[PDB]
Amino acid sequence: VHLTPEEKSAVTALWGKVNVDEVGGEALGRLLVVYPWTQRFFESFGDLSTPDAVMGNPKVKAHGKKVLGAFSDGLAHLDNLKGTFATLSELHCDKLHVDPENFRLLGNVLVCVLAHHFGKEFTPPVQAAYQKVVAGVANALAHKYH
Amino acid sequence: VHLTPEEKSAVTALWGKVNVDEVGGEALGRLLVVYPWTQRFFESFGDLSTPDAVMGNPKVKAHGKKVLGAFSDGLAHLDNLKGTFATLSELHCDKLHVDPENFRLLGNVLVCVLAHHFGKEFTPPVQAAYQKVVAGVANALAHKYH
Amino acid sequence: VLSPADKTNVKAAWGKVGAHAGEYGAEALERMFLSFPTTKTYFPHFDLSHGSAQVKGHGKKVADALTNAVAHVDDMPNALSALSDLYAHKLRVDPVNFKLLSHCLLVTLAAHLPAEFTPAVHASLDKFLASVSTVLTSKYR
Amino acid sequence: VLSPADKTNVKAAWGKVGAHAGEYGAEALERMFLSFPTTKTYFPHFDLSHGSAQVKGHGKKVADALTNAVAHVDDMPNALSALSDLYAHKLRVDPVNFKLLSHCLLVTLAAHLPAEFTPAVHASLDKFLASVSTVLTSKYR
Numbered sequence: 001v002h003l004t005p006e007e008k009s010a011v012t013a014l015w016g017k018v019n020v021d022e023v024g025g026e027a028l029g030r031l032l033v034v035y036p037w038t039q040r041f042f043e044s045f046g047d048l049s050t051p052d053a054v055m056g057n058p059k060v061k062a063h064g065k066k067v068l069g070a071f072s073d074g075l076a077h078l079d080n081l082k083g084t085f086a087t088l089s090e091l092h093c094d095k096l097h098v099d100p101e102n103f104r105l106l107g108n109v110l111v112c113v114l115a116h117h118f119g120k121e122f123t124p125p126v127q128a129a130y131q132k133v134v135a136g137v138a139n140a141l142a143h144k145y146h
Numbered sequence: 147v148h149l150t151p152e153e154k155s156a157v158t159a160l161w162g163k164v165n166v167d168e169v170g171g172e173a174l175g176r177l178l179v180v181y182p183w184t185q186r187f188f189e190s191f192g193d194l195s196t197p198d199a200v201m202g203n204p205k206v207k208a209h210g211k212k213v214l215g216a217f218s219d220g221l222a223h224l225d226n227l228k229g230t231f232a233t234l235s236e237l238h239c240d241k242l243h244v245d246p247e248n249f250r251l252l253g254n255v256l257v258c259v260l261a262h263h264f265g266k267e268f269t270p271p272v273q274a275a276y277q278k279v280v281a282g283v284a285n286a287l288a289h290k291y292h
Numbered sequence: 293v294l295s296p297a298d299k300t301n302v303k304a305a306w307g308k309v310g311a312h313a314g315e316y317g318a319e320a321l322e323r324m325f326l327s328f329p330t331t332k333t334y335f336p337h338f339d340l341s342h343g344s345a346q347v348k349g350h351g352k353k354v355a356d357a358l359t360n361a362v363a364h365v366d367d368m369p370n371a372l373s374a375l376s377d378l379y380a381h382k383l384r385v386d387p388v389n390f391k392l393l394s395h396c397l398l399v400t401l402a403a404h405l406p407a408e409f410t411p412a413v414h415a416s417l418d419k420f421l422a423s424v425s426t427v428l429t430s431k432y433r
Numbered sequence: 434v435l436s437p438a439d440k441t442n443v444k445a446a447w448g449k450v451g452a453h454a455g456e457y458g459a460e461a462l463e464r465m466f467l468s469f470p471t472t473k474t475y476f477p478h479f480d481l482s483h484g485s486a487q488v489k490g491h492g493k494k495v496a497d498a499l500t501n502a503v504a505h506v507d508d509m510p511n512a513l514s515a516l517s518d519l520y521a522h523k524l525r526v527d528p529v530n531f532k533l534l535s536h537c538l539l540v541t542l543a544a545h546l547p548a549e550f551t552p553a554v555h556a557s558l559d560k561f562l563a564s565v566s567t568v569l570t571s572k573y574r
């Protein structure tokens with residue numbers, strides 16, 4: 001996936017403003033609320049029984065932070081997403097057995113969370129750039145499946 | 147996408163026994179029958195109102211020859227599908243206004259037609275190779291959209 | 293199916309959209325054309341530039357149909373019956389595209405109505421938009 | 434919706450499958466695992482090698498559910514209700530995968546029943562398999 005130089009600058013600038021303590025947990029939590037069958041992968045995380053329980057679950061927040069950190073790693077290596085995510089791709093396939101369609105769902109949930117957090121500033125051109133990013137991350141995470 | 151050398155050999159061997167003219171008309175006709183909303187692009191072809199009308203339509207058959215001839219030409223460049231199909235991609239976007247999802251539908255209809263024609267010879271591994279081919283062609287034809 | 297809570301959530305969120313519905317529909321279309329350029333293949337006769345009068349007019353058509361669907365949430369197949377006829381016989385938009393606009397409508401609502409866009413309401417809105425999309429393509433074959 | 438002709442076509446084609454239903458279910462699964470390797474993520478507890486007993490047994494279960502749906506083509510939601518409950522609460526397969534298996538079932542039928550797999554029957558079988566898939570995912574949220 002190819003971001004223009006203007007798109008790269010816009011994605012980098014917005015990402016610097018992200019609340020790294022909250023955005024990842026909000027994306028993971030919304031995935032588990034909006035697509036509740038995805039809770040299958042997180043049975044060990046405890047109480048996922050209501051939207052409030054999901055979003056306030058400390059394990060959802062903590063894991064979401066790790067997910068966000070991996071997204072940050074991708075944003076720092078936009079010309080090599082496949083190499084950035086190869087180890088996590090093997091992990092999600094061989095160890096965790098996660099259908100990569102879920103990476104698409106999570107990417108679009110993250111876009112919704114960015115729109116929620118940034119309001120007006122999440123303009124249609126900024127969204128289009130982030131759609132390229134989340135698709136590229138999903139493709140890279142799916143790449144080592146076999 | 148990329149095929150193993152064994153997959154390339156299997157693709158080329160089967161394709162040498164394809165009547166490209168006949169299979170193209172059959173695949174295009176089946177696209178219009180199975181997914182009849184795709185008829186929107188072909189009003190000038192006339193009567194498409196029943197399966198027999200579609201499958202016997204001489205314009206469907208004549209166009210299918212051209213479609214599958216271009217597909218056949220692409221099989222000569224399995225390592226460069228995006229380059230080979232760039233002009234046709236620009237045409238389908240800029241002049242014909244064809245949603246590239248249609249290329250994915252036609253690719254899987256083609257797979258069904260190959261299975262129908264060849265029977266047991268269209269083994270699960272041969273299908274897997276052709277799935278990589280049709281996905282690569284669809285992706286190549288979608289690549290110059292903007 | 294839409295639960296009683298889903299219907300309550302959708303009516304509240306879309307009620308708050310209110311008179312902004314057409315403007316938000318136009319923004320959702322613009323987001324979709326920029327993010328998912330293949331969707332532009334359905335509008336070769338449109339000026340798709342930012343602030344386009346044609347995009348604004350289409351946004352109003354989309355939004356007003358959604359307002360009608362919300363007002364008839366208990367029986368959307370009947371309320372949308374003429375629209376689904378027109379889709380199956382003429383418009384014939386591939387089903388994949390409705391998911392793209394639905395996502396862009398969620399983004400638009402999240403960016404505009406942060407107090408409304410809770411996780412539960414997000415879930416209900418996504419179900420609602422998928423149900424509308426299902427009705428729109430229900431007569432395709 | 435399945436038309437009268439769709440029901441006739443599905444019953445005729447599946448009737449010709451006859452005693453081979455379980456074998457064709459296993460072949461369709463094998464085709465899907467080879468062509469679409471992401472589908473294997475739902476089977477970490479299976480030997481997925483060619484001819485494995487687990488794939489054979491699962492193919493029989495898939496085929497039996499399809500045979501039952503054919504026998505209940507007038508009311509598939511009711512006939513598939515228990516299976517749809519199990520999908521929503523336990524199996525939880527993403528909807529995209531049903532399209533992959535459905536395609537592989539069409540390929541399998543085409544490769545075994547050339548006289549039966551006419552364009553009209555192909556169209557009806559695709560509608561039928563999509564309708565079954567919709568029921569199976571209908572209670573997910």
Ligand code: HEM
Pocket residue numbers: 038041042044063066067070071088091092096098102103104106107137138141
């Ligand atoms: C698409 C972007 C995603 C990224 C960047 C990502 C990243 C990560 C990372 C960094 C870890 C921790 C790895 C470790 O500590 O060794 C992880 C674990 C995990 N991921 Fe993902 N992930 C993504 C999507 C998903 C999705 C969509 C699902 C399921 C629906 C999922 C399921 C899991 C599970 C179950 C674990 C292990 C959690 C545990 O029990 O500790 N991942 N992921």
Ligand code: HEM
Pocket residue numbers: 184187188190209212213214216217234238242244248249252283287
């Ligand atoms: C393997 C995929 C495809 C290939 C290789 C292909 C190739 C071609 C070629 C070679 C032409 C003739 C161009 C010319 O003579 O200048 C053409 C025309 C056209 N294609 Fe495609 N095509 C594909 C898929 C599709 C699909 C799936 C659709 C729509 C459902 C479509 C819609 C059209 C239309 C409307 C025309 C113009 C027909 C006319 O002259 O009336 N194409 N295509």
Ligand code: HEM
Pocket residue numbers: 331332334335353354355357358375378383385389390393424
């Ligand atoms: C929430 C989803 C949608 C709703 C409620 C909706 C609603 C409508 C309505 C009310 C019309 C006018 C129909 C009439 O003439 O009576 C229309 C037309 C149309 N829509 Fe949809 N729409 C939706 C999504 C989409 C999407 C995703 C696409 C394409 C990517 C699309 C493409 C079109 C086109 C091309 C027309 C004809 C426009 C023209 O030529 O002026 N719509 N839609």
Ligand code: HEM
Pocket residue numbers: 472473475476491494495496498499516519524526530531532534535562565566
């Ligand atoms: C025509 C579509 C399908 C039908 C009719 C079907 C039918 C069935 C049936 C009857 C069962 C047994 C349920 C029970 O224990 O009572 C089952 C189980 C299962 N299915 Fe589906 N299935 C279909 C597609 C799929 C797809 C596409 C996938 C994943 C890619 C899938 C994954 C599974 C799994 C993982 C199980 C549990 C197997 C086990 O643990 O032994 N199925 N299916």
